[model samples]
Target: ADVQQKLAELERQSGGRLGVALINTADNSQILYRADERFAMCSTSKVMAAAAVLKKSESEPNLLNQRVEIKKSDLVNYNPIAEKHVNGTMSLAELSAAALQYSDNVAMNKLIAHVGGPASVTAFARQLGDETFRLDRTEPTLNTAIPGDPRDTTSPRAMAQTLRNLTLGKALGDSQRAQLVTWMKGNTTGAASIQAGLPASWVVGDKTGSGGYGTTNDIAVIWPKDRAPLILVTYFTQPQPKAESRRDVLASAAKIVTD
Candidate 1:
């Protein structure tokens, strides 16, 4: 009951637009605010990219395990995961993990290329019954969050629902789903957002995003020790270019959801 008011207060103090979608996966119950409004997808698109690859692997079977050679040229800025494997080969699955766990730019670009293009990730979302999620550009370029532009954007509700499908619904094989979840579980990027609001005993799988125009986003699937699993997506943004992204906004919204 107090969730909306509290979040509104947070938005006022943070000077940002806050979109949130929290879903109880077992029953499809949701509490959403500005759920249909689009925000820059930012690094969050990497999750959809990884899931798209995993979804394609079900039919191709060998896509995940196929080894692809890496070279110096393939490496680019923000290549934390790729630099470690330079001159070595990594399978699609490994690359997906790097993109998810480390938010590695090169790993994400490689996966986006593997799927054909940015549009292919959007196509995969449509195939999974999601129509509002779209990807328009690869990394670095994708982070240029023009205030009202629609490129590379998705609604919080759409992201939450799509995450439910990818993590718990029939969109992926059991092993594939588990692998994605495992990678998210080890995510090195979320300690200050949703994870900050979670119970220490609970388990969570999530991906985080940070970008220009004060975009700080996180989508997560959480499992409480004694209850059904839940999904949460919070996308926060300020319209100005130099506005600072606020992890506190996400953590505060998460506290409301968990309460």
Candidate 2:
């Protein structure tokens, strides 16, 4: 109750529509703050794409190692890492790593293509029992928009359940889940959101999403020293006045859970 109250207070202070889902996996204790509202997922959708590809690899064992040529025209504007390798060839696993680690737009689209299309990714989410999560569009289409539409949106609860499934090996096999967790741990973006709220010794495996119109989100598996790990999902829309405030609110909410 105390954690819930603190999260609610932070949501009120955020000056935006905020959704949070914090789950302590050990005892199944959970805290939800406006968990029903859906917001633009942005690059976070790449995680779903990764899952789809991993699922495909289950029956088609060679899928991960199959190489694909990434053309310069295929490269998008956001990720510097993808920009560097604009005309190179990489395996599906490599592309998934780049997409997850750097939130590379081009790499994500390539993975999406590899797994059929956007609908496959959303279908993967639904298979995990997430009805509100949607992934109707690709990165190029979403990034060019002002605030991005709700077409590729997810509620905090849905995102949390997705992560929870992944973490518990419900979404992927042990080897595949390990691979996905490694990619998440290597995530290079969103240094200012949930990661900023953690103690230096704590480890976080997460995916982040942001947009032009005050959309900031982080979904993570947090491992606190000598304690059971917890999953934290925070999503905010129309974050007031400045972007940093949204991050600060996330940090504060994290502190409430960790402290």
Candidate 3:
């Protein structure tokens, strides 16, 4: 069966919306399923926030080493790091690693503030040719709908492109890009998404995001042994009650692309 047909079948079997984008960076070949549909980005937006900080670090060399205190008020549910270190101080780099590696909401919020609020992240995305990506709210208010609240969203294509740019070192300097990729590689979350479908020889540097309203997402630059890396972004949304279902779909999709 064709890749698209397989993906469509998986979408049907899962009974939820799926958006996927796969890019073979070696040959520049691309495959997209529901590539244009907008979905909640959840914690995946932290990559953009991290990018903004990295960009600023180019001029502010000490930005990464600067210390930021994580107050108790900054704590949010589901953040293990913040819960452990309430009212503690950490370097910006430490906070960023905690955010990217562990998806710590408190750490993410501190980084967001350091980079001049959510708008700066949106501006950074715009500079990367991702005008449709939005970061209109903070972590405390995440996934909560409000009157006239701008949706924190992105299309699969846009996200894939962003990953490609980051891999190509277009979004950050060579050293900074390497640092960010290291953080991603160290990520302990999303083991069941794209990483679940890969062979033991493959390595995946990725981030995962989830929302209360059935949003589950994984975006990664996957490297197969002795082969070039491929960028894959998978998003599942709209009433997916079981997180395992989304993981199954994502794993199947990753297998299709890698095979």
Top candidate on TM-score is 1
lDDT of each: 0.89, 0.79, 0.83
Q: What is the per-residue lDDT of model 2 for residues 181-246, given as tens digits with 9 covering 90 to 100?
A: 888888887677898888989889888877656667788988888888889998777734344435
Q: What is candidate 1's lDDT per residue for 57-146, written digit by digit as tens?
A: 888988988887788988766888789888999999889988999999989989999999999999999999999988999888898778
Write down the TM-score of every candidate: 0.96, 0.91, 0.94
CA deviation > 4 Å runs, candidate 2: 143-149, 239-245
Clashes of each: 0, 0, 0
Residue 195, candidate 3: Cα error in Å is: 0.7
Give residue 120's lDDT in candidate 2 (0 to 100): 84
**Ten-residue region with minimum lDDT total, candidate 2:** 141-150
lDDT of 3: 0.83
- Could you give the C-alpha RMSD of every candidate to the true structure, in order shown? 1.3, 2.3, 2.3
lDDT for each residue of candidate 3 in 115-219, tens digit (9 for 90 to 100): 788888888899988888998889967655222234888899999998889865567898889988999999999789899888978999999987754667899
- Clashing pairs for model 2 are none
